[PDB]
Design a protein around this nucleic acid. Structure first.
Ligand SMILES: C[C@@H]1CCO[C@H]2Cn3cc(C(=O)NCc4ccc(F)cc4F)c(=O)c(O)c3C(=O)N12
Ligand SMILES: C[C@@H]1CCO[C@H]2Cn3cc(C(=O)NCc4ccc(F)cc4F)c(=O)c(O)c3C(=O)N12
Ligand SMILES: [Mg+2]
Ligand SMILES: [Mg+2]
Ligand SMILES: [Mg+2]
Ligand SMILES: [Mg+2]
Ligand SMILES: [Zn+2]
Ligand SMILES: [Zn+2]
Lengths: 61, 261, 47, 239, 261, 47, 61, 239
DNA sequence: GTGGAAAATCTCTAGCA
DNA sequence: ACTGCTAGAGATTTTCCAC
DNA sequence: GTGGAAAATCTCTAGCA
DNA sequence: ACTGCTAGAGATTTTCCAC
């Protein structure tokens, strides 16, 4: 049911940057993807990254 | 030190001393010396020491024209993946760029193109081509190549590869295509240890799949969450936190002080 | 209100003061004598 | 842990490894080995090239038969060099491994052979004809919107690839080709993993067992068509 | 993967793939892929990402010629302190530079001059002037401005200051002298919060005083220290450590396993 | 023994291999076909 | 006698850099000055800095 | 802690503040106040300019009277503009505060007045003559080594400043001027410190006492010509 | 022991052309 | 065998002052 | 629990012209 | 109302494998 889809979305990985740091942050875990923002979880921390600062991939590793 | 203020103001009008010099030689507090410096129009000669960040959405391509051996190479790069396409065009004209853009939009889902203010990119032909294909045009601040950093970088990379394979072709067009092939499918590294082609396929497929899954979830999962406000749509929950959106303002609240109906 | 001093287009001479209309991440839109300019923050100083 | 349920499900229904891995949370190598353990369980990079004519101009068309994705270009003349250039452009954009051609003089030129050799493409001498008919129909539809034929051809390619939908899932050719290439990438990563682990022998003394998965605190192995799990401490792995 | 080595060698001879691509597409260990890449002459196109450090001894000056408003400005900087002297010279000639160098050596203790390979600096006239004044000449690696970074930086700074005071003079020579004055005695900062003139005076005075004091100490304090070796002349002791100089190789040893006679 | 590939004088083309004669901090002295050159380490690669 | 001169020498301050770090290290304490090297003490640590990487000043603070 | 010994030493010998600070390890402000507390105890930026003539050429000479450091330059003519340019060069190189001139027409020009005003120099209208004689002697000695007179003049300046030693300590003019300017910098830093602390009043209630030193864990103050030390906790400092 | 505030230290970039 | 650096604009960490 | 070694992560620079 | 980045060469921190 809904849980399988939530877990599937959760399986994707997100690389993101903060508003001043130019280095790309590690492979966070996607939780929500929206039209303008993506809600991710990086090291037990939830963040709301603008869509323009996110690269979302299901790494085929 | 009030008389020191006038003495330092005259001293600065003459010599334009920095705040340290005025503070030391007139016993001014650093705030007053900095104010004296900041009131001088002639001493405002340095900008902020930072760099912006370009857009890296899945649908943004950065285009540029580079030159090599007297030829013009029009290069487009997918910002999110590093995937490049390059064509040797006879001249930097609006017609050639519009043709290149229509080709590019026919192969991959181009939603916006970011370019410098070169005459070819600003021509009404490219505007018409983008309008027909539904592409949004972004222009960087004039004479600010950093705004196109990504594509600029790729120019370098492209030329490098050509330097390694120019001896394997009789013409520059073939060498350019060889370099594009090598960059897209023979250079691995980056976010996922990927090639550029693998990375772009992953990016596009992930966009489609996440859109589809999120559409289904929002169709199925329906809740309203109150915290601390109005009818804030529920977005996600778990690990002792609830992420919600209220008036289109996404926020994260602790599981406590939050009720879901 | 702010004062912006900027270097806009391949012109080493700095200009200003100008009124700050909008501040963003990486660029600022300013008004300098009824003329609107967009300047990267690397080439602008705001007081 | 959940290997036995997956094996029983495979025996009942003969399901593929993607389904088993998704359902029973197994590493894909284990599911692939489960599928390969049954004796009764035993394209993405293939392109078809043709050159049509329209308004006395030559249109070279490449079709991804697995998806219907189209790449069309108006070329000056049916020349070997130009076909080679088009093929090199195509190979630099998509992972082309095989190309089918109609034995035409341009397609059999030494220049095209050299281009395919450099790009690592194998050459073999009615999807293409139907796709050409559809492309010509779209070109006729949009010809009022373009002064030249090359622009009309590119508009037709765009419309066909992205603004036309159909099939079982109502997808366009672009989505289908992206999905097919993604599946191919997954398959090749899995094959690389299998090749990486196929040169290990594990003793758990129990006979020399093949290695299927080395986890954080477990070692999943196969012996005589029986899949087992043993502790990292109890297992000894060699080349 | 032994056959993979040959397959990857052919693949690299064709496409010049990086070690990641070869390792991924041929199951090669990273060492072998890196070896394959490192054996290709065409793939050696990048140097190490590091910067050297220029000499900063008290007696080294860096000289350069900059241009402004069609005029030639010969600028010298004391590397240790940032103290500058600039003169507008009629032309980039050896005679003018030799005159400037003799003037400079007559005011401050110039022991070494470090310069680019410009024709004026490499002229036999400057060589004779340096020989007479006992100055050693160092030339940076050709077309490597970073070797003269300090003076290059000062050029920038100097011009900046001129831009602030050019309106206060009717000639560029006067503006240059005003800029030199402002830099030397009206801009404070750096290691000691000093200005350039104060810093150079401090550097020179400290050099003289430390030389004198160390001469006295050495004439007075005589000891020989054995550690672990030979008769290593004692240099310093305290805080549970002894610094010694054995065979002109200064070293620091623990107070233990060290005996002083 | 080492192999040095270098870019010497405002010439974007890299050269080499060459024999490393002396390595210092920020520069290396190399020999390339009976020709001695001094190259900053930013413009040299040693294997 | 000798201790006054040693203390005077020790009063001087030394700024120095390491062989790869481009940032100048804080005001160390001079212990010995030679023709080629200067022996300093920075945070209870004795170092032997080459003369070309040292700025020795008696800060008039 | 060592203030009383320093005070007694000053009473017996009337020593200066540098000596007391060095000997008794007091902060310089305390020693300066000790010196200023007694009644019985109550130049580095002064230059002399002249214009000599040699071989029918004008040599402008500046002498640091406190040290004998020389700066000479052959100028085209005794003009106000040339003198002003020389003065600006000199002021940009050394901390010139006052200049003594011989009432010559060039030295009294409005251009020189403007240059001195901009550089913050005060103008006043036998060290210089003796130094000119010595410089002419050195120029005569070295004239065989220079084709032109300007080069000979610069060589003479170099020899006089650095290759001639004498006096009580056997020092050169360069060393002497560097030492004098360093002492001037020390004096100005001390004066800045005194100015900074002179606008505090400290209560330790005991009357309003001036502040002399605010240490890490002590406050040294003066009251009615008696120097005392208090802990920071007992002391209250106000502007 | 602790907030505010001021001061010190750290990070980073343009221009030298 | 020789070698990037300087100074200013924010930002962040430290220390100081009264409670 | 621990050395060696291999792998992953971090730091930094040139060129884009 | 817009925005430096990419990939390679060392260096340093992490993890893995047997003892
Ligand atoms: C004819 C002489 C002799 C042969 O070399 C040329 C060319 N050149 C070029 C620069 C220059 O490129 N400056 C910009 C720059 C770039 C990077 C950096 F780290 C420092 C910098 F100053 C100079 O400053 C310079 O003085 C010269 C020069 O004098 N010459
Ligand atoms: C006539 C068009 C329109 C108006 O602007 C000019 C000049 N220009 C200049 C550079 C350039 O300066 N590249 C070097 C570079 C420097 C810094 C950086 F971050 C990135 C960089 F690429 C370009 O790349 C470029 O494309 C153009 C260009 O196209 N035009
Ligand atoms: Mg461009
Ligand atoms: Mg460009
Ligand atoms: Mg130069
Ligand atoms: Mg220069
Ligand atoms: Zn100012
Ligand atoms: Zn290669």
């Amino acid at each position: 049911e809904l849980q399988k889809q939530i877990t599937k979305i959760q399986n994707f990985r997100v690389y993101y940057r903060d508003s001043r740091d130019p280095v790309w942050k590690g492979p966070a875990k996607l939780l929500w993807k929206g039209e303008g923002a993506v809600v991710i979880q990086d090291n037990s921390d939830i963040k709301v990254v603008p869509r323009r600062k996110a690269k979302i991939i299901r790494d085929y590793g | 030190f009030l008389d020191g203020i006038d003495k330092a103001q005259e001293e600065h009008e003459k010599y334009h001393s920095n705040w340290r010099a005025m503070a030391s030689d007139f016993n001014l507090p650093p705030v007053v010396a900095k104010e004296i410096v900041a009131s001088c129009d002639k001493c405002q000669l340095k900008g902020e020491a930072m760099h912006g960040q370009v857009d890296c959405s899945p649908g943004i391509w950065q285009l540029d024209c580079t030159h090599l051996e007297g030829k013009v190479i029009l290069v487009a790069v997918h910002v999110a993946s590093g995937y490049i396409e390059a064509e040797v065009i006879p001249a930097e004209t609006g017609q050639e760029t519009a043709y290149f853009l229509l080709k590019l939009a026919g192969r991959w889902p181009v939603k916006t193109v970011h370019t410098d203010n070169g005459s070819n990119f600003t021509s009404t032909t490219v505007k018409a081509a983008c309008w027909w294909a539904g592409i949004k045009q972004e222009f960087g601040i004039p004479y600010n190549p950093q705004s196109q950093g990504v594509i600029e970088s790729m120019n370098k990379e492209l030329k490098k590869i050509i330097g390694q394979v120019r001896d394997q072709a009789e013409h520059l067009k073939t060498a350019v295509q060889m370099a594009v092939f090598i960059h897209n499918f023979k250079r691995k590294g980056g976010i996922g240890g990927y090639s550029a082609g693998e990375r772009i396929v992953d990016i596009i497929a992930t966009d489609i799949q996440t859109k589809e899954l999120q559409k289904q979830i929002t169709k199925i999962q329906n809740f309203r969450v109150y915290y601390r406000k109005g009818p804030a749509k529920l977005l996600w929950k778990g690990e002792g936190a609830v992420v919600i959106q209220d008036n289109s303002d996404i926020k994260v609240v602790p599981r406590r002080k939050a009720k879901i109906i | 209100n702010f004062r912006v001093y900027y270097r806009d287009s391949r012109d080493p001479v700095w200009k200003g003061p100008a009124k700050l209309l909008w501040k963003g991440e990486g660029a600022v839109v300013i008004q300098d004598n009824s003329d609107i300019k967009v300047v990267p923050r690397r080439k602008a100083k705001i007081i």
